[PDB]
Amino acid sequence: QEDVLAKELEDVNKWGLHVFRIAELSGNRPLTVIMHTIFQERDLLKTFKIPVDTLITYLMTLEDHYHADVAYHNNIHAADVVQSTHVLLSTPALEAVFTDLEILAAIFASAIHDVDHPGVSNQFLINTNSELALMYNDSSVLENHHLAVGFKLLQEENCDIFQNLTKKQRQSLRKMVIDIVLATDMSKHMNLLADLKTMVETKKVTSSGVLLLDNYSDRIQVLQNMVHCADLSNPTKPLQLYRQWTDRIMEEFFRQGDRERERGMEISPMCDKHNASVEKSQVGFIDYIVHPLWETWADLVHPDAQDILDTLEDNREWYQSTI
Amino acid sequence: VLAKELEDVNKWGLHVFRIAELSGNRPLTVIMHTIFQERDLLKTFKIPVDTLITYLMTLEDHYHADVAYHNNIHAADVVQSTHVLLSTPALEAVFTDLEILAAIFASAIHDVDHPGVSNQFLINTNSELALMYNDSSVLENHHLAVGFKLLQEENCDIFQNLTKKQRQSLRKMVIDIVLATDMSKHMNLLADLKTMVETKKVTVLLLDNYSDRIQVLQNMVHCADLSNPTKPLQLYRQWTDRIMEEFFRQGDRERERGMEISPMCDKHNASVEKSQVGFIDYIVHPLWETWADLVHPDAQDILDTLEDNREWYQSTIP
Ligand SMILES: COc1cc2c(cc1OC)[C@H](CCc1c[nH]c3ccccc13)N(C=O)CC2
Ligand SMILES: COc1cc2c(cc1OC)[C@H](CCc1c[nH]c3ccccc13)N(C=O)CC2
Ligand SMILES: [Mg+2]
Ligand SMILES: [Mg+2]
Ligand SMILES: [Zn+2]
Ligand SMILES: [Zn+2]
């Protein structure tokens, strides 16, 4: 029903949106309806003269190119990252900091950032001599692919949502989107976090108390880390959402491990369904990856993200308590 | 006949155009085969000679015969120049046989399927290649992908007898080297070579960590790629004629499409000779001067010839 879905989408500005309920109520179109809602909320159709029928046509085609048969890296994950990026962009420490084009780039990058993901890792694709790894010379294999598909779909019939941007706007947005999606490669995490830490330690704020970002390198680095935080935000969400994300990533990992075991390869970490500890893996994920990242983001925008960090820390203690 | 010319495969200034003619437009194949035997690579890595020839022929076929510069003759020239640079005395022990294999294979594939237009042209025209590769080292990613993909054709897997680790190490090194031939990386590459020269440790060069060794290999193949002005003048002048034909054809396409014409690509305004002098002064000589410092004094004859050729091109400007 449309009324109940409209009611749920009133939460689009809130951390912890019931994204699985929105997927059900929208008829498995969470990415389309959440993107459309966000574009209306931020007045992006009027600002960039995006025809509404073109937006819907592109969104439905993009959503179609996520795999409905992968447990984690599907259109619900994309919708979740889009919405989480949308909330992070609204944080008071960043008010009036980014232009309308940078906002468009960050939201578009989130929407396409995992498109056509096959449900296995870059290393699996490299180690199996996949056609994707051969195409991309073993370097950010999935992320180059997500970008290429995301942009190529703009060329389908009535899909060019950027048709009314100027040529310079299109060139700038394309560069920013590429910079952002390539930064979601998990092998870049340590370098991205090291740079975010440096920016926190050298942070400057303006007279209005918002973050001072006066060059492309700093601006794109904040947008890269923002989308990376959104991508790694599952343990910061209310527990009933977090546990569903955990169930889904473990299913994807175990299916990868079954293909590795069947092929005689070493099983990747956390992918052996016969020797895995789901709870210990979440605590380690939080301790070594997610909390170091979110604690640093929370410092950059202090005190805006304190409640998100509080939820992360509660969820860590809950998983720890199940061991 | 063709055999006599191949006797100087170990000399800077091989008559590569004569070899291209005398081999029926197969310079990459015959030069690669000759080099693999001078370095005993077929025995070291147990490469079936017929597999080596089948792959080389196939690779050569994927260079475009209607591209005046970035064709199979260029690929053969860079291969042969790397082969000579690998024999620099100051590098007499630095690199292992697999590293030698990687530098030579990388040279052979480093421009395969080149369309005769630049990365910037491919980006600004919204080409399929730039869409595939997200505007980042577009050509060089493609050269690699084609070069490795051809290994999978029938009786083309020249690395069939390398160990699994050797194949994985060779692949990484080839990728690192070919990606470094992107001209947009030149200044960063040169800066690293300069830093290495300043921190140079010698007994002969001592390079201990992979990062330093791959950097020397990157800069070496880069030097080979940019070696035309260091060759004997009759060779250099042919390379100049060929690159200018390729540039002018690209500029004809940019003019028509309404784009800004790339530097040196406007046939109605370009000075071929001024462009060569500027090319040497700003790119080729700073690079080869720094290389010469790294292997001092083994590059001094190459540097001398470059400086002679620069003097000659300058004298052709009224
Ligand atoms: C909800 O839980 C998860 C969600 C996700 C992951 C792992 C989760 O739980 C262990 C992994 C992290 C990959 C990864 C790379 N290096 C690591 C080192 C340690 C741990 C993980 C990783 N993802 C894979 O695409 C993203 C989503
Ligand atoms: C024999 O002469 C040449 C040979 C080559 C080039 C230029 C030559 O002569 C002007 C260019 C150099 C790169 C380059 C592209 N745009 C530039 C602008 C300024 C400086 C360098 C470049 N190449 C292009 O594939 C490699 C071979
Ligand atoms: Mg991803
Ligand atoms: Mg090239
Ligand atoms: Zn993701
Ligand atoms: Zn080349």
Side-chain angles (χ1 to χ4, degrees), chain A residues 1 4-6 8-13 15-20 22-23 25-45 47-151 153-265 267-322, chain B residues 1 3 5-10 12-17 19-39 41-42 44-45 47-49 51-91 93-96 98-153 155-163 166-197 199-200 203-233 235-248 250-259 261-318:
Chain A
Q1 153 85 260
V4 298
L5 170 67
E8 293 287 340
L9 289 164
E10 291 166 24
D11 294 349
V12 67
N13 299 330
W15 205 250
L17 175 79
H18 300 309
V19 66
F20 294 100
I22 278 177
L25 295 163
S26 70
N28 200 22
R29 298 292 205 171
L31 180 62
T32 299
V33 303
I34 281 168
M35 280 284 279
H36 187 198
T37 299
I38 287 160
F39 273 54
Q40 296 174 332
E41 167 86 1
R42 296 186 168 280
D43 220 3
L44 290 168
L45 296 103
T47 297
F48 291 110
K49 313 202 217 326
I50 307 174
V52 53
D53 51 305
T54 312
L55 178 65
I56 303 301
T57 307
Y58 178 80
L59 287 173
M60 293 181 88
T61 311
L62 174 68
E63 189 149 27
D64 284 357
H65 287 75
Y66 279 86
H67 293 217
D69 55 342
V70 303
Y72 184 94
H73 286 101
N74 55 45
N75 59 321
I76 313 176
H77 171 62
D80 179 39
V81 176
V82 162
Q83 193 261 341
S84 296
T85 292
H86 165 71
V87 175
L88 293 175
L89 279 165
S90 304
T91 199
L94 301 172
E95 175 177 13
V97 160
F98 293 109
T99 68
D100 293 334
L101 193 68
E102 289 161 338
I103 289 163
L104 182 62
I107 294 169
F108 182 75
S110 300
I112 68 167
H113 86 276
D114 273 332
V115 64
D116 202 33
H117 196 300
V120 292
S121 70
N122 277 333
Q123 197 62 244
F124 179 91
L125 293 174
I126 292 160
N127 288 348
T128 57
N129 314 119
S130 61
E131 166 67 60
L132 271 185
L134 183 72
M135 179 76 65
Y136 286 118
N137 299 302
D138 296 348
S139 310
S140 299
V141 171
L142 288 158
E143 294 75 21
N144 274 290
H145 182 62
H146 305 320
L147 280 162
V149 172
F151 285 113
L153 290 176
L154 297 165
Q155 302 175 359
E156 302 296 317
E157 177 194 77
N158 200 16
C159 287
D160 188 10
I161 62 174
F162 306 123
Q163 66 191 72
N164 287 325
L165 272 62
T166 66
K167 175 237 88 200
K168 170 267 143 195
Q169 278 171 330
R170 288 165 68 104
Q171 169 186 260
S172 171
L173 179 133
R174 174 167 165 82
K175 177 176 207 320
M176 290 190 283
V177 169
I178 289 162
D179 284 349
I180 290 166
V181 174
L182 287 178
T184 62
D185 177 347
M186 256 310 286
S187 73
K188 309 197 167 140
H189 163 82
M190 288 302 167
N191 271 40
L192 210 57
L193 177 55
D195 285 342
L196 185 62
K197 278 173 171 338
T198 300
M199 160 172 313
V200 171
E201 182 71 33
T202 60
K203 185 210 297 192
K204 308 277 207 74
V205 297
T206 79
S207 295
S208 297
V210 300
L211 208 58
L212 172 59
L213 304 179
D214 70 354
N215 58 86
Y216 180 77
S217 182
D218 283 344
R219 299 170 80 79
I220 200 62
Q221 169 189 357
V222 173
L223 292 179
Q224 288 169 322
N225 275 289
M226 179 185 296
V227 172
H228 181 55
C229 285
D231 201 16
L232 295 178
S233 62
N234 304 157
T236 75
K237 295 296 169 70
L239 187 57
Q240 88 284 351
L241 288 166
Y242 178 19
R243 284 190 66 187
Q244 296 184 246
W245 291 121
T246 299
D247 289 341
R248 288 171 173 268
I249 196 65
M250 288 316 293
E251 172 172 346
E252 205 172 287
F253 282 0
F254 290 164
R255 282 160 84 171
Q256 179 176 317
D258 286 352
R259 293 169 71 181
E260 293 170 333
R261 190 186 306 103
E262 167 166 36
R263 285 168 165 265
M265 329 188 264
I267 297 176
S268 295
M270 302 171 288
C271 294
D272 185 354
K273 63 187 170 187
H274 296 129
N275 307 308
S277 169
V278 170
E279 298 78 19
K280 283 152 62 125
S281 289
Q282 282 310 309
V283 171
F285 180 47
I286 291 173
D287 287 351
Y288 290 97
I289 297 307
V290 179
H291 190 273
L293 175 63
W294 274 94
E295 182 175 42
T296 300
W297 180 266
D299 281 337
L300 187 70
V301 304
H302 194 285
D304 300 3
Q306 189 55 58
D307 292 340
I308 295 172
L309 201 56
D310 284 351
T311 299
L312 176 60
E313 289 170 3
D314 287 348
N315 285 345
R316 193 265 185 204
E317 299 316 332
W318 183 87
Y319 265 104
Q320 171 70 24
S321 76
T322 64
Chain B
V1 46
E5 218 70 61
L6 290 169
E7 190 161 0
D8 300 300
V9 284
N10 309 306
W12 209 253
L14 185 83
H15 297 156
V16 68
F17 294 106
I19 288 173
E21 292 193 66
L22 298 159
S23 63
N25 200 23
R26 294 273 182 201
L28 183 60
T29 294
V30 313
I31 285 175
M32 281 263 102
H33 192 163
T34 303
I35 282 167
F36 269 52
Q37 318 166 327
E38 166 89 3
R39 284 179 181 288
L41 287 173
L42 294 123
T44 296
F45 296 107
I47 309 162
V49 158
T51 306
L52 183 66
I53 271 65
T54 309
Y55 174 80
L56 287 176
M57 295 271 294
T58 318
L59 175 71
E60 188 146 31
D61 280 349
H62 284 77
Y63 281 89
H64 299 188
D66 60 342
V67 166
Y69 185 93
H70 289 101
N71 54 49
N72 58 318
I73 313 178
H74 174 57
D77 177 47
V78 178
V79 153
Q80 193 263 339
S81 299
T82 300
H83 164 48
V84 176
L85 292 179
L86 280 160
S87 295
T88 310
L91 304 172
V94 167
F95 304 107
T96 191
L98 193 68
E99 285 157 341
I100 286 164
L101 181 58
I104 288 170
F105 180 75
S107 295
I109 69 173
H110 84 281
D111 276 332
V112 64
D113 202 31
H114 200 296
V117 294
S118 66
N119 276 330
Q120 201 52 239
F121 181 93
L122 294 171
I123 294 161
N124 292 351
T125 59
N126 315 120
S127 67
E128 278 290 283
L129 270 185
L131 268 171
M132 177 75 70
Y133 286 118
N134 301 305
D135 298 347
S136 309
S137 299
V138 171
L139 284 162
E140 293 73 25
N141 272 290
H142 182 61
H143 305 317
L144 282 159
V146 172
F148 285 107
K149 166 93 170 304
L150 294 172
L151 294 167
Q152 291 168 18
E153 309 278 323
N155 188 216
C156 279
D157 184 11
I158 65 175
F159 309 123
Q160 48 189 92
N161 285 331
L162 273 62
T163 76
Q166 275 172 151
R167 301 200 56 164
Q168 145 191 358
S169 184
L170 181 147
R171 176 167 165 80
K172 174 166 191 334
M173 289 194 297
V174 172
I175 293 167
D176 287 345
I177 292 165
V178 179
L179 287 178
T181 65
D182 179 350
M183 297 303 328
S184 73
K185 314 224 169 107
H186 165 81
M187 291 298 186
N188 282 342
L189 211 47
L190 177 52
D192 286 340
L193 192 71
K194 267 163 188 210
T195 299
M196 163 161 335
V197 156
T199 69
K200 184 169 159 200
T203 68
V204 171
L205 265 187
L206 300 165
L207 308 158
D208 188 64
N209 52 83
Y210 172 84
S211 169
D212 280 348
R213 277 199 312 289
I214 194 66
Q215 279 173 17
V216 172
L217 288 180
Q218 291 171 322
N219 274 282
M220 166 180 312
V221 176
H222 186 50
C223 280
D225 208 15
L226 300 177
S227 60
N228 303 159
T230 78
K231 299 286 176 88
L233 188 58
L235 290 171
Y236 178 20
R237 292 172 73 186
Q238 291 187 76
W239 290 121
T240 293
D241 282 341
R242 285 171 171 272
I243 194 66
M244 290 313 292
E245 181 169 323
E246 202 172 300
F247 284 179
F248 291 167
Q250 163 175 159
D252 290 351
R253 301 174 47 175
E254 294 163 330
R255 193 181 307 107
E256 186 282 340
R257 290 175 151 259
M259 323 179 245
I261 293 178
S262 304
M264 300 170 296
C265 291
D266 188 350
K267 64 177 172 201
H268 299 130
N269 289 288
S271 175
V272 168
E273 298 80 14
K274 287 174 165 180
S275 290
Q276 279 315 304
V277 172
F279 181 47
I280 290 167
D281 294 348
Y282 292 113
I283 302 288
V284 179
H285 194 275
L287 173 63
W288 274 95
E289 207 203 3
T290 307
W291 181 265
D293 283 347
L294 187 67
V295 301
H296 187 101
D298 322 323
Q300 265 48 30
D301 290 340
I302 311 281
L303 202 52
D304 286 349
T305 305
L306 173 59
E307 288 158 12
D308 295 338
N309 288 341
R310 191 259 185 213
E311 179 178 43
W312 181 88
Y313 261 104
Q314 178 65 42
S315 79
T316 67
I317 303 162

